[PDB]
Amino acid sequence: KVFGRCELAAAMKRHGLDNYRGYSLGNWVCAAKFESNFNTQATNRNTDGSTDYGILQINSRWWCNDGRTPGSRNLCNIPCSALLSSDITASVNCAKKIVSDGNGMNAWVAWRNRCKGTDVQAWIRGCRL
């Protein structure tokens, strides 16, 4: 599913991501924009042979099992395929675990390089939230 900007914001908010660990909703939307262009079916292979899945491009090395990432962990205890669903519940729950683990949203390279330090609230501008 390709989400609309405001449509994902509301979904992200209903699932409790707005100010989760201090990160305003606009940070989460910005990250999704630049990780997946709001597309739940987004998949991208990493050089180490792991793969990133979903709206927030969560990585098979540590977080989910895709059965093809040697030495992987599955800390969110899920099939990476669950991260591709129209229902973003699994992606959000998993995102919550990741962002809680010491490094904050720096875990998302596109967030660090494209959102951090910007006017991230522009990303929820004009949404009815």
Curated annotation (Swiss-Prot):
- Binding positions for substrate per the UniProt entry: D101
Does Metal-binding appear among the keywords?
no
A cellular component term, taken from the record's GO annotations = endoplasmic reticulum
Catalytic center residues: E35, D52
Which superkingdom? Answer: Eukaryota
Q: Which GO terms describe its biological process?
A: cell wall macromolecule catabolic process; defense response to bacterium; defense response to Gram-negative bacterium; defense response to Gram-positive bacterium; killing of cells of another organism
Q: Where in the cell is it found?
A: Secreted
Which residue numbers delimit the C-type lysozyme domain? 1-129
In the record, what terms sit under GO molecular function? beta-N-acetylglucosaminidase activity; identical protein binding; lysozyme activity
**Entry comment describing in which tissues the protein is expressed:** In the egg white and polymorphonuclear leukocytes.
Q: What is its main location?
A: secreted
Disulfide pairs here are C6-C127, C30-C115, C64-C80, C76-C94
Summarize the subunit comment.
Monomer.
Family the entry assigns? Belongs to the glycosyl hydrolase 22 family.
Q: Which PANTHER family match?
A: LYSOZYME C (PTHR11407:SF28)
Any remaining note in the record? Lysozyme C is capable of both hydrolysis and transglycosylation; it also shows a slight esterase activity. It acts rapidly on both peptide-substituted and unsubstituted peptidoglycan, and slowly on chitin oligosaccharides.
Q: What protein is this chain from?
A: Lysozyme C
Instruction: Give the organism the record lists.
Output: Gallus gallus
Q: Which gene encodes it?
A: LYZ
